[PDB]
Q: What sequence folds into this?
């Protein structure tokens, strides 16, 4: 129940990786969702591949 | 630097065709382009409308 501006997060030069499956990282503003969930946790760098 | 790839260079400074039929060749330059205290002669573009 909100407006999700995903251009700010993508353009910010702070993320080590931004890899999207199912959706394209650029064509994200013209789509909308019933809900979006953010699963947040800390891992070891070498575990990103898993 | 690859066809079908995105990022701040792929979109702003070097975009490849998605049907590219070539080769990507690379080697490190730590003993040639780098300079002590930072070699500030290589420019990039992080913003574009």
A:
């Amino acid at each position: 129940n909100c407006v999700a501006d995903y251009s700010v997060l993508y353009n910010s030069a702070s993320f080590s990786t931004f890899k999207c499956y199912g959706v394209s990282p650029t064509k994200l503003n013209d789509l909308c969702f019933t809900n979006v969930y953010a699963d947040s946790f800390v891992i070891r760098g070498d575990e990103v591949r898993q | 630097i690859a066809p079908g790839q995105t990022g701040k260079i792929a979109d702003y400074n070097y975009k490849l065709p998605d049907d590219f039929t070539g080769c990507v060749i690379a080697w490190n330059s730590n003993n040639l382009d780098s300079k002590v205290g930072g070699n500030y002669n290589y420019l990039y573009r992080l913003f574009r409308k």
Notes: The two ends of chain B are 21 Å apart (CA to CA).
